[PDB]
Amino acid sequence: ATFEIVNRCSYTVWAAASKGDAALDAGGRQLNSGESWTINVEPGTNGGKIWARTDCYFDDSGSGICKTGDCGGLLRCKRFGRPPTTLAEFSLNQYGKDYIDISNIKGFNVPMDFSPTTRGCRGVRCAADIVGQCPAKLKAPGGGCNDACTVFQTSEYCCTTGKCGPTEYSRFFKRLCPDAFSYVLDKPTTVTCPGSSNYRVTFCPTA
């Protein structure tokens, strides 16, 4: 599958792509405002994620830090990033279908649209000003709006027992972005696409 990753934000982001135990394609790249990065993701990839990182500093060897979404200090991510991170999530070619979603379960840093570029399904978007409206106790100093599990580490927010309900904090994310997962047992907002679809992830789709 082909993913085109587009930065429509007025600021630079460092895109990342990983399936948790390996990079997808190069794993990460700087995207100045307006730049596009095309990557190739192997068919059958399960549990892939794409996200943006903000305010990064990398040396010549590709080592450094980011204020949101840092993946162990590497430019080219092999593992998932530090919250807060708006997540584009996908599993490809699962019994003939692709499954895509946007998730706020690990917080929110950058607005995002995640859409197919081929026929057969719809896209999803979370583009509200979640950072501006973020409850005080979830605000991340580096930028972004943390999820409640990251901040408070309770069974209820992290859904550790497999039983949990919505919370004041999850309802905040759900109000501003109904089409994104707001907690682990949220009613799924997953979209089913034809197997082997292609996609575009756009950061700051409205601005």
Side-chain angles (χ1 to χ4, degrees), residues 92-105:
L92 310 180
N93 310 98
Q94 305 293 302
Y95 302 104
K97 296 299 183 186
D98 291 357
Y99 296 94
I100 69 168
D101 67 81
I102 291 177
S103 175
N104 288 321
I105 290 170

Side-chain angles (χ1 to χ4, degrees), residues 32-51:
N32 295 324
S33 177
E35 289 189 328
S36 302
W37 179 34
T38 298
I39 66 170
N40 292 283
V41 174
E42 191 188 29
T45 293
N46 180 86
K49 303 187 197 302
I50 288 161
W51 67 103

Side-chain angles (χ1 to χ4, degrees), residues 18-140:
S18 174
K19 61 178 187 76
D21 62 346
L24 300 177
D25 198 287
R29 215 201 87 172
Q30 182 174 326
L31 291 179
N32 295 324
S33 177
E35 289 189 328
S36 302
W37 179 34
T38 298
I39 66 170
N40 292 283
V41 174
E42 191 188 29
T45 293
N46 180 86
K49 303 187 197 302
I50 288 161
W51 67 103
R53 300 169 284 174
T54 61
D55 289 311
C56 303
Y57 298 86
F58 293 111
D59 62 23
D60 37 288
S61 72
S63 294
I65 197 167
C66 303
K67 288 196 180 175
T68 66
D70 187 69
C71 61
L74 300 179
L75 169 63
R76 290 161 288 267
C77 294
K78 295 185 299 175
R79 67 190 218 204
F80 294 139
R82 189 171 190 271
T85 53
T86 319
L87 295 168
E89 307 183 307
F90 47 93
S91 295
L92 310 180
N93 310 98
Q94 305 293 302
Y95 302 104
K97 296 299 183 186
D98 291 357
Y99 296 94
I100 69 168
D101 67 81
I102 291 177
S103 175
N104 288 321
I105 290 170
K106 297 288 186 184
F108 176 103
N109 62 339
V110 176
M112 178 189 280
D113 179 276
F114 186 9
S115 291
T117 55
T118 52
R119 276 187 114 84
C121 52
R122 69 173 185 89
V124 285
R125 177 178 296 196
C126 176
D129 187 13
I130 284 179
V131 178
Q133 300 295 2
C134 190
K137 290 177 183 181
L138 300 183
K139 292 174 164 296

